[PDB]
Design an enzyme around this catalytic site. Structure first.
Site, short mmCIF file in Angstrom:
data_model
loop_
_atom_site.label_atom_id
_atom_site.label_comp_id
_atom_site.label_asym_id
_atom_site.label_seq_id
_atom_site.Cartn_x
_atom_site.Cartn_y
_atom_site.Cartn_z
N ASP A 124 1.00 -53.49 1.46
CA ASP A 124 2.15 -52.93 2.18
C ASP A 124 3.41 -53.73 1.87
O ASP A 124 3.70 -54.71 2.56
CB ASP A 124 1.85 -52.94 3.68
CG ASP A 124 2.92 -52.25 4.51
OD1 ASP A 124 4.02 -51.95 4.00
OD2 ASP A 124 2.66 -52.00 5.70
N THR A 125 4.21 -53.26 0.89
CA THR A 125 5.46 -53.95 0.52
C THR A 125 6.51 -53.89 1.63
O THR A 125 7.49 -54.65 1.58
CB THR A 125 6.05 -53.36 -0.77
OG1 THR A 125 6.33 -51.96 -0.57
CG2 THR A 125 5.06 -53.50 -1.93
N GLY A 126 6.37 -52.98 2.59
CA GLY A 126 7.28 -52.91 3.71
C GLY A 126 7.01 -53.89 4.82
O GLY A 126 7.80 -53.96 5.76
#
Length: 198
Positions: A124-126
């Site tokens: 999850d890059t967010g």
């Protein structure tokens, strides 16, 4: 462009004639923008996240220019804390996750081993942080509150936890609490050399 994950992967977008910054978010199925003026018809919808649910307005067939790449798709507008570009648009700008290369037509799930246990988790890059569903971990922890799309949850913070993510060892902080999905965030993604490429 290639994007490392030592900072949030923010890009400039143009939508509805307006310029905004948004987070390239491999953990998000959908694209969610803060309240803004858009034209035309919309449908009411509820979407979930860490913290619970929010009500949004669903706009379909919206043109958005993400870092100079054009995409058309569904955009949700409502009380998200951050503008997020989700996989419905990331796939259109050729976004891949590299650490093995991962396209984003499906959720980027990996197998992890932590505290002797095998789990599945979302790359999850967010997410600044790594958040796992309730589980047995050994040792001391500190109470913490973290926020997300639907509000806040209370978690237990464990430091210096060893995790093997898709066979790659990392050590760092792991939060444990009522998240809907296991999330590997940037604090560990950087240790396995994850990059965003589009």
């Amino acid at each position: 462009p290639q994007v490392t994950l030592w900072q949030r992967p923010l890009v400039t977008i143009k939508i509805g004639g307006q310029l905004k910054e948004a987070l390239l978010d491999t953990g998000a199925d959908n694209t969610v923008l803060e309240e803004m003026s858009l034209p035309g018809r919309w449908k009411p919808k509820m979407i979930g996240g860490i913290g619970g649910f929010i009500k949004v307005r669903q706009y379909d067939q919206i043109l958005i220019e993400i870092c100079g790449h054009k995409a058309i798709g569904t955009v949700l507008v409502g009380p998200t804390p951050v503008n997020i570009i989700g996989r419905n648009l990331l796939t259109q700008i050729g976004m891949t996750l590299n650490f093995p290369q991962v396209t984003l037509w499906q959720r980027p799930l990996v197998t992890i081993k932590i505290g002797g246990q095998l789990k599945e988790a979302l790359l999850d890059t967010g997410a600044d942080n790594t958040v796992l569903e309730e589980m047995s971990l050994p040792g001391r922890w500190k109470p913490k509150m973290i926020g997300g799309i639907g509000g806040f949850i209370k978690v237990r913070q464990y430091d210096q936890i060893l995790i093997e993510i898709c066979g790659h060892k990392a050590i760092g902080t792991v939060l444990v609490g009522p998240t809907p999905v296991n999330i590997i965030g940037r604090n560990l993604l950087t240790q396995i050399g994850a990059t965003l490429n589009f």
